Each structure stands twice: as C-alpha cells, then as structure tokens.
Design a protein around this ligand. Structure first.
Ligand SMILES: OC[C@H]1O[C@@H](O)[C@H](O)[C@@H](O)[C@@H]1O[C@@H]1O[C@H](CO[C@H]2OC[C@@H](O)[C@H](O)[C@H]2O)[C@@H](O[C@@H]2O[C@H](CO[C@H]3OC[C@@H](O)[C@H](O)[C@H]3O)[C@@H](O[C@@H]3O[C@H](CO[C@H]4OC[C@@H](O)[C@H](O)[C@H]4O)[C@@H](O)[C@H](O)[C@H]3O)[C@H](O)[C@H]2O)[C@H](O)[C@H]1O
Length: 122
C-alpha cells in the first residue's frame, strides 16, 4: 500500500452548472511528486463518508476528462481499478496526464475523505 492522503478533507458541492466543482483530494503529477507508479497495475482506494464520489484523470490538451464511478463500495471504502480508468481515459498510457482528483457528486451535506491510497496487483 502507498498512502497519497490521510487526514480529513471536506468538500461541499450542491450542483453542477456553477463555477467550481471542488475536490476532496487532488494532485497535479506534472509538478507534485507521488510515490504511486501509474505504469504498474494498480487500484485506488478511498475512505470516505457522505456524497457519492468519482475519480477523475484529465489531460488538458487532448480535452480528456475520464470520470469513473467506484468498482465497488464496502465499509465506507471506494475502489477504482486501472482497467476502469484506462477505459474512461481512452488508453492505459497516462503520459501527458495533468490531473487526478476525488470529487463528490451533487448533494446537500458534501463529502469527507479520511484516506486515499494506491495498491499494486498481480
Ligand atoms: O484547460 C482548462 C483547465 O485548466 C486548469 O488549469 C484548470 O484548473 C481547469 O479547471 C481547467 O479545465 C476545466 O475544468 C473544469 C472543472 O474544473 C474543476 O475541476 C478542475 C479543477 O482544476 C478546478 O479547480 C475545478 O473547478 C471543467 O468543467 C467541468 O467539466 C466536467 C466534465 O465535462 C467536461 O469534460 C468532459 C466532456 O465530455 C464534457 O462535455 C465537458 O463539459 C463537467 O462535469 C460533468 O457535469 C455534467 C452535468 O453538468 C452539465 O449539465 C448541467 C449544466 O448546468 C452544466 O453547466 C453542464 O456542464 C454531468 O452530467 C457529468 O457527469 C459531469 O462529468 C462539469 O460540469 C464542468 O464544470 C472544464 O471542462 C475543464 O476544461
């Protein structure tokens, strides 16, 4: 396991159509370091409470916005697989990738995220 975040980030988000869709967690891998190696086979797990969430990968210059629903949710932990991300992204090659974020879908009380990690698979 590789920990990308633990703590408690809250994000509020009532509706699309406004100016800001905020992240409960996000990183910009062109600038910020991360131990997670996207060329290996991986899963991303997020511990959370509240609104349903999506995982986003985005590349600003191909206009790519891969947006993924959890593979499953048990015990307040969401799981996202490489295979899912790839399918949404168009490809399993992530060179050029600009943006990874965990975002809530529209709701009244928002979402709280306590942990974000990645796991390597065989
Ligand atoms: O190159 C610009 C890029 O540079 C960065 O520096 C900047 O930080 C980025 O913000 C910016 O990219 C633009 O980001 C916004 C969202 O920005 C948020 O996330 C990134 C953060 O950096 C920033 O701080 C945040 O505020 C994008 O707009 C959002 O796009 C998504 C996804 O949809 C877009 O891409 C996929 C394509 O298929 C779509 O056609 C395209 O719009 C939207 O999410 C979708 O929302 C709809 C419902 O909303 C729609 O219907 C209702 C209407 O009122 C609303 O206006 C409509 O959009 C859902 O059905 C989908 O499920 C969901 O995916 C967001 O709504 C939209 O705000 C820019 O597109 C991106 O260029």
């Amino acid at each position: 396991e590789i920990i990308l975040f633990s703590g408690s980030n809250h994000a509020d988000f009532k509706a699309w159509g406004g100016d800001d869709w905020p992240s409960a967690f996000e990183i910009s891998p062109k600038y910020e370091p991360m131990k997670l190696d996207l060329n290996k086979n991986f899963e991303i797990k997020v511990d959370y409470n509240g609104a349903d969430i999506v995982l986003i990968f985005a590349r600003w210059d191909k206009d790519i916005w891969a947006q993924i629903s959890p593979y499953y949710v048990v015990d307040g932990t969401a799981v996202f697989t490489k295979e899912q991300i790839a399918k949404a992204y168009g490809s399993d090659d992530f060179s050029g990738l600009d943006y990874i974020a965990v975002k809530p879908l529209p709701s009244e009380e928002g979402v709280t995220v306590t942990k974000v990690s990645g796991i390597y698979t065989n």
